[PDB]
Design a protein around this ligand. Structure first.
Ligand SMILES: CCCCCCCCCCCCCC(=O)O
Ligand SMILES: CCCCCCCCCCCCCC(=O)O
Ligand SMILES: CCCCCCCCCCCCCC(=O)O
Ligand SMILES: NCCCCCCCCCCCC(=O)O
Ligand SMILES: NCCCCCCCCCCCC(=O)O
Lengths: 252, 60, 238, 289, 289, 238, 60, 60, 60
């Protein structure tokens, strides 16, 4: 079957016995920066295996009423082994990613998750004439939570799922690369995102290249199904990471 | 040193073209490219590796 | 001096004109183009992408994820119609804020076939067959499965293939319909019925949700640009 | 092709409807798996019997160029011929397309855009209301001046700065055709960025969003006759018509109303309009109920 | 090539960054002797390991032609339609680019320059302030007249001299496009001289500097309707756009402000702005101190 | 009469237009060109020439030849940093009135590598090694030699070759930076440290000066013409 | 008797040229030479007789 | 600038003029022509058809 | 890329033609087809199957 699938990057391998397909960016596989597209003149570092491998973030629990979750991206992997170290030491960085969201349940459970990568997901403030916080935006690994109602508070993102923190119709998030995890048919989602930005390279602390959102559209449900615990786990692997402008490490 | 190309067809199923000459030194000064009509829905409606033949199951 | 006559139109400013103009920055060296993924070329590329339809746009769901869930269940409910809605892609609440709908609202005319994809989200042990029907205009909405099956329809069998596509072929007296639809450019309705109820084994939920996605087929186009009704302002610093 | 040229053939025809008859097989085109993230490619002929139709419909008007290439008001302001405020003697703003919504929502459908811009100005003047209204003011001549970031800024209608030895300026007299000029793709980057989920400072603070990326300078406009016995006031309107366009990574159209120019901020708003029930379809076709 | 022609190809590309690796030798490119008066030709690849970069950046906008070729105000004056002073009925100055600084500092970057000039005039009129303001004055028509050194000079708005049988003149009516014309390289010498460390008299006295070399005549401008029941006043602004340029022996840009038009005089001024200490570098990147 | 339509723009006066115009002096015989030495063709020719940087632009030196002297001396001062400054060629006091700086101020955008030449002016019997470092943006200025040597740097050995060149390679997210620099277009800093103190024999001065010259490399260019902030006036007869 | 030459390239990586005809009898009337881009830094950055190879000492 | 003289008539609006004019809808795709029976081409085609004469146009 | 065709003949029994160039991208912008003169009265004056020779009876 084509439900079966394996992926290997560095010293790490992922497997599934129930995959859908694999979505690829806007049809573009990651590539390293070409000479006719570059401006930064110094030799890049391309750690390769030490850096382009699967990092697993802390899992989250899918509850019968979870609104959703999100993660900002280059930031979030900032403490992941050498990928993070290379971030701290360089002014410029560039990478693509293989994102693998995992969630298994049973033939007697039901629910459906939308898994999307939104490039440049600028978010709005709860306090309409106020401004956000970096904290209201991301908490590294972990994950911010969407909300079922309008939120208040200065600095926090106006997170009612319904508008995805961006002021649009959540049900239109599909123009972005994505897959669905429909428990009855599927147990994981895989998206390969290429580097997307309006400049060839960028600083990885100052700019969230894209946001990963996991939003349940049909809620988790089950019966005397002595399994109420249904976790979701995000594993991601940088691809073609290259860095420029080496100097002392950035201030935490 | 001019260019002749065809007009967008109007009210009926040789005199259906126009001529143009650029008078400025910068491409920015030129008129719009209202006649270029390419298309590639694929980037968006079907960005799956592993070609989906759809007349076949899609899973299995 | 070469003899000349100015024609009506001279000196006007037409929003949609298309002339050459002097550059205020002679010889400016523009920054090199960069090959960014995801280049868009025609708004139809966007309309051809599925987006989730808020079929259950009932009072009270307007700001909750329910508006996107069509309720369906185990037990005898055959007489009970599952849902129904008018086919006015740019006008009815069910469609207007959809990816296809938002795009249609920047135009005054549309034409083409539409794809409605329905996906079942119950447990894998759940089972069932539905009848998805589209009725071209001229009569009122079918009021029973008997009446609905006399029109265009698919009988969907829930199985490993979680989704089923009801394609609404373009059937119209005219080549185009107003996006701001009227009775003259009516397009009919689609309704859904249990063809043979939802059966389920013990230990599984007795009710689930069906979602509905819409997108344009490849014979779809739009004409006559206009502003959207959807955005506005009372003052500047916008 | 080359997206800088004002000519380029080819009809944008939609697809013909292939004639289709009856079928009994294992082909199951109407059954797909939406989970893959793929949009089904089914056409009428896959699910009903269709006749053949030679379709001539073209998608010409929905090409990105034809969708954006229409002048749109992106700003308007006033300035007086005469006043005690000095400040009110000239107008000035900071270039951006974020202050008028129509244009803004159109651009924001794309994450990045690249293009040249045709700027057209519509200037009008009115005589202010007052007890004495008789005067004979000659034609008003205006000066529009663009100040790239970093240039000296005018402090009065008579500042040396209006000498424009280098800033580009336009002098225009009322009654003639509206002033106009093309501006090239002026970004520091490879494409103008409409959204930026980032900060200005490396320590993840400072200013968030679109603003940190802007900085395209500002415009100053003043009268040149400089006087009028009785007070008058002019309004300057600026229009943008992008041309020679390229756009990337489309996003959903803005759903909630805009709250201000510097942010993407919004209030929670409804997904769509309500209706009576999930089965409600109004009855047309009745001897009028 | 020929610096008189309005067309001429070739891209002004900067240098590519040559890819460079590790080195251990006697090559010592980073060590030179500045005493020779030579500026080092070191590029990044001589001192750090560099990648290869195909650089498309061009120096088109910093070519002398594109730097000077933008109209600049070089003078402005007023004259009245009606007055008791006779003198105030027409304007007159002596041609030079030394009365408005922006243009002047641009030219003064070069010791000698040669070029044709596109002169554009912006003329505006306003009705003077007064108790009675009602009148119906037809359109004002002006006369601009150039008087080469040695020609008879007007003594009133009605002097025979305005007959211009030979001086070149421009008649223009308000409401139309600003008047404009090209003037060729008019010098007695081989290049206009911006500085002259010399005298007018052979005995090393007389007048010092730029002025002794000038003498390009003057401009007179008057109204032609000649009247208006109530007083009005016009302002004439003249703009210079050099074109078909050549420049020699560049010099530092003027640092001190200009004190007057006939001299290079200045007051002692600071080399640059101060800062706290020779090691002071502000701390950006902090959770905002 | 040939039919014509006037387009928006007709009759305007754009400062940077570029049209033909009648000559007011038909057939004037211009004086012959003379081949003068030193012809300039692009302002970059000037920016490529070294000019002295006023590194010591401390209060009190603004009008004395000291602003150009970097103080360095014999004895133990390792912990003591020799100097440091931001890399904002068109904006910071250290550079703005430089040959390169004055030129950058007539433009709004710049890009390219920069050369910093350091020349030692102590006695010939003086000796010493310095560490010249450039740190790309993203962190605060190195506060010790340890931190500084982690970035781009040369170790300069004073010898017969009186001068040493620290070249600042172009490292930036964007192809261009604002001359009126902001944090978004930050370029980092260069700092200097004793690598191994200044040693000297008896009978020679125990302190000397190091001068610093700046100039553009051959990958340098500028765009978007604008007026300089540096010159102004309150009235005519200028 | 006209001249066709290329336009300065704008917003993208045959219709990229313009045509010009001179209508006046004096060269002064012509438009500016905004397209000529020569360069010779040498006059200024390196006016030393005795070629400095600089990769070599420069003194010695 | 090419030298020009405006002739009498400039700027007038003659009901029966016949000039080109900018389209306010660039590239609009007109709906396909359909072959309807009864196409008229010259009003004389109508005058050549018999119609009944009211010869007895008497009061009443 | 222009077209030359003849003028409608006036006040007398080579210089009787004009030249035209289209400057717009849409056919709608073109001038009127005042020179096309076809005709087919038949559709209306004689829409009878069975050809009426009329010099013959028409009945009988
Ligand atoms: C820079 C202004 C240039 C003016 C260009 C006008 C061209 C006039 C049409 C001349 C006849 C076409 C010659 C061929 O090609
Ligand atoms: C002195 C005024 C001269 C007027 C010149 C106008 C030239 C008109 C373009 C004619 C067509 C191009 C002929 C070739 O060459
Ligand atoms: C889109 C505006 C185009 C302007 C077209 C003007 C044509 C000028 C006549 C040039 C001489 C005819 C060349 C042949 O064909
Ligand atoms: N005198 C006109 C000066 C025009 C400069 C305009 C720059 C416009 C840039 C368009 C920016 C739109 C965007 O941010 O997407
Ligand atoms: N009616 C205009 C008369 C114009 C004569 C202008 C001569 C301008 C010469 C430019 C001199 C600038 C310089 O001394 O460098």
């Amino acid at each position: 079957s084509d439900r079966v699938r394996s992926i290997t990057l560095g010293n790490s391998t992922i497997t599934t016995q129930e995959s859908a397909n694999v979505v690829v960016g806007y049809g573009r596989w990651p590539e390293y920066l070409r000479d006719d597209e570059a401006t930064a003149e110094d030799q890049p570092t391309q750690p390769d295996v030490a850096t382009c491998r699967f990092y697993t973030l802390e899992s989250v629990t899918w509850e019968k009423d979870s609104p959703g979750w999100w993660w900002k991206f280059p930031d979030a992997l900032k403490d992941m082994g050498l990928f993070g170290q290379n971030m701290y030491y360089h002014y410029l960085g560039r990478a693509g990613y293989t994102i693998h969201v995992q969630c298994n349940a049973s033939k007697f459970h039901q629910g459906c998750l939308l898994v999307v990568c939104v490039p440049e997901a600028e978010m709005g403030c709860s306090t309409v004439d106020g401004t956000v916080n970096e904290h209201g935006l991301s908490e590294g690994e972990t994950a911010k939570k969407f909300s079922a109602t309008g939120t208040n508070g200065t600095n926090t993102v106006q997170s009612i799922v319904t508008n995805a923190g961006m002021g649009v119709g959540v049900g239109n998030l599909t123009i972005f690369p994505h897959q669905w995890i429909n428990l009855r048919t599927n147990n994981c989602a895989t998206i390969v995102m290429p580097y997307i930005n309006n400049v060839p390279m960028d600083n990885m602390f100052r700019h969230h290249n894209f946001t990963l959102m996991i939003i349940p559209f049909v809620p988790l449900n089950y019966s005397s199904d002595f399994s109420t615990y249904v976790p979701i786990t995000v594993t991601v692997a940088p691809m073609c990471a290259e860095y420029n402008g080496l100097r002392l490490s950035t201030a935490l | 040193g001019a260019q002749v190309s065809t007009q967008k067809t109007g009210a009926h199923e040789s005199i259906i073209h126009y001529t143009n000459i650029n008078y400025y030194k910068d491409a920015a000064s030129n008129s719009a490219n209202r006649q270029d009509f390419t298309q590639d829905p694929g980037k968006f409606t079907e960005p799956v590796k592993d070609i989906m033949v759809k007349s076949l199951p899609a899973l299995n | 001096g070469l003899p000349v006559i100015n024609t009506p139109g001279s000196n006007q400013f037409l929003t949609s004109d298309d002339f050459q103009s002097p550059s205020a920055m002679p010889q400016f060296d523009v920054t090199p183009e960069l090959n960014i993924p995801g280049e868009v070329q025609n708004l139809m590329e966007i309309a051809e992408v599925d987006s989730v339809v808020p079929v259950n746009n009932v009072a009270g769901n307007l700001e909750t994820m329910d508006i996107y869930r069509i309720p369906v269940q185990s037990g005898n409910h055959q007489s009970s119609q599952v849902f129904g809605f008018q086919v006015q892609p740019g006008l009815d609440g069910v469609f207007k804020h959809t990816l296809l709908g938002e795009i249609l609202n920047y135009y005054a005319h549309w034409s083409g076939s539409i794809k409605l994809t329905f996906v079942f989200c119950g447990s894998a042990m759940a089972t069932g067959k539905f009848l998805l029907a589209y009725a071209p205009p001229g009569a009122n909405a079918p009021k029973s499965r008997k009446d609905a099956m006399l029109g265009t329809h698919i009988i969907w069998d829930v199985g490993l293939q979680s989704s089923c596509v009801l394609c609404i072929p373009w059937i119209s007296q005219t080549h185009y319909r107003l996006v701001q639809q009227d009775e003259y450019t009516s397009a009919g309705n689609v309704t859904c019925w249990y063809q043979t109820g939802i059966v389920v084994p013990a230990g599984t939920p007795t009710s689930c949700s069906i979602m509905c996605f819409v997108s344009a087929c490849n014979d779809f186009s739009v004409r006559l640009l206009k502003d959207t009704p959807f955005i506005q302002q009372a003052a500047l610093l916008q | 092709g080359d997206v800088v040229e004002a000519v380029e053939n080819a009809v944008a025809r939609v697809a013909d409807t292939i004639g289709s008859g009856p079928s009994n097989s294992q082909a199951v085109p109407a059954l797909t798996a939406v989970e893959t993230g793929h949009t089904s490619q089914v056409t009428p002929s896959d699910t009903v019997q269709t006749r053949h139709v030679k379709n001539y419909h073209s998608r010409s008007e929905s090409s990105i160029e034809n969708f954006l290439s229409r002048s749109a008001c992106v700003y308007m302001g006033e300035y007086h011929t005469t006043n005690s405020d000095q400040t009110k003697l000239f107008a000035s703003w900071t270039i951006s397309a974020r202050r008028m919504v129509q244009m803004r929502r159109k651009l924001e459908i794309f994450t990045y855009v690249r293009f040249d811009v045709e700027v057209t100005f519509v200037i009008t003047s009115k005589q202010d209301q007052g007890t004495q209204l008789g005067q004979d003011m000659p034609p008003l001549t205006h000066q529009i001046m663009y100040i790239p970031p970093g240039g000296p800024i005018p402090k009065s209608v008579t500042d040396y700065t209006w000498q424009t030895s280098t800033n580009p300026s336009i002098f225009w007299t009322e009654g003639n055709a509206p002033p106009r000029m093309s501006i090239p793709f002026i970004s520091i980057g490879n494409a103008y960025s409409n959204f930026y989920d980032g900060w200005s400072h490396f320590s993840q603070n400072g200013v968030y969003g679109y603003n940190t990326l802007n900085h395209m300078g500002q415009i100053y406009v003043r009268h040149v006759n400089g006087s009028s016995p009785l007070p008058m006031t002019s309004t300057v309107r600026m229009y943008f018509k992008p041309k020679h366009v390229k756009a990337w990574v489309p996003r959903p159209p803005r759903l909630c109303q805009y709250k201000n120019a510097s942010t993407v901020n919004f209030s929670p708003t409804d997904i769509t309009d309500k209706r009576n029930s999930i089965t409600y379809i109004p009855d047309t076709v009745k001897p009028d109920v």
